[PDB]
Every structure is written in C-alpha cells, then in structure tokens.
Amino acid sequence: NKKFLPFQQFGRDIADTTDAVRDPQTLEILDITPCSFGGVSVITPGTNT
Amino acid sequence: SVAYSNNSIAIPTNFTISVTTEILPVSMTKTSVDCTMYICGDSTECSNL
Ligand SMILES: *[C@@H]1O[C@H](CO)[C@@H](O)[C@H](O)[C@H]1NC(C)=O
Ligand SMILES: *[C@@H]1O[C@H](CO)[C@@H](O)[C@H](O)[C@H]1NC(C)=O
C-alpha cells in the first residue's frame, strides 16, 4: 500500500533486503512475504512409557 | 566536618519511611537461529559444502 514513484521500484526493509517490488511490464505495487516457515519440533514421552 | 564528643551523643527523634525501587533483568530474549536458512538461502551446493 506504499507510495511508489514511477521510477521507484525496490522497497527496502530495515534489514536492507528486497521488500516491495513492481513488475517492469505492468505497473503494480506488490508486497513480498518470505517462505520457509520455522523448524521441526517433536513431542514425545518416555519410550518405556 | 561532623562533630565528635566524649560524653555526648545524638539520638534520632523522628523518622521517614522511604520507598526504594530496584530493577533487575531476569530473562534475555530467547533466540533460536537456524543455520541453513541463514547461510545457504535457497541452495544445494552451499548445503553440500
Ligand atoms: C573527654 O574528652 C575531653 C576531650 O579533651 C577531655 O577534655 C575530658 O577530660 C574527657 N573526659 C574525661 C572524664 O576525662
Ligand atoms: C515527624 O516528621 C513528620 C515529617 O517527617 C512530621 O509531619 C511530623 O509532625 C513529625 N512528628 C513528630 C512527633 O515530630
């Protein structure tokens, strides 16, 4: 929902990476949310139980 | 230069109840850091190395 000037293409975050973009073919404001959510947690009781 | 005597003394006659506030840290921010998503962002040869 930001204010992209027509030359402004790349939104940067505080972490200085790519945040918000625009298609060079069609003028449109986009937002990016990265994939690879978290890790694997395993719950188990005692094996003898 | 607080005075001092041989046969005289100073005894309090009235008091004051003061509230003192201490601040102690207890919990650091718990942090889990994955290594592969940190180092090798979307790669195979990086993980093989
Ligand atoms: C207590 O100390 C003072 C300090 O000079 C002295 O003059 C006095 O004689 C002392 N008291 C006694 C009982 O000696
Ligand atoms: C003791 O001190 C308080 C303030 O510190 C005062 O308001 C009060 O009247 C005093 N009382 C006596 C008996 O000296």
From Swiss-Prot, chain A:
<comment type="function">
    <text>Attaches the virion to the cell membrane by interacting with host receptor, initiating the infection. The major receptor is host ACE2. When S2/S2' has been cleaved, binding to the receptor triggers direct fusion at the cell membrane. When S2/S2' has not been cleaved, binding to the receptor results in internalization of the virus by endocytosis using host TFRC and GRM2 and leading to fusion of the virion membrane with the host endosomal membrane. Alternatively, may use NRP1/NRP2 and integrin as entry receptors.</text>
</comment>
<comment type="subunit">
    <text>Binds to host ACE2. RBD also interacts with the N-linked glycan on 'Asn-90' of ACE2. Cleavage of S generates a polybasic C-terminal sequence on S1 that binds to host Neuropilin-1 (NRP1) and Neuropilin-2 (NRP2) receptors. Interacts with host integrin alpha-5/beta-1 (ITGA5:ITGB1) and with ACE2 in complex with integrin alpha-5/beta-1 (ITGA5:ITGB1). May interact via cytoplasmic c-terminus with M protein. May interact (via N-terminus) with host bilirubin and biliverdin, thereby preventing antibody binding to the SARS-CoV-2 spike NTD via an allosteric mechanism.</text>
</comment>
<feature type="glycosylation site" description="N-linked (GlcNAc...) (hybrid) asparagine; by host">
    <location>
        <position position="48"/>
    </location>
</feature>
<protein>
    <recommendedName>
        <fullName>Spike protein S1</fullName>
    </recommendedName>
</protein>
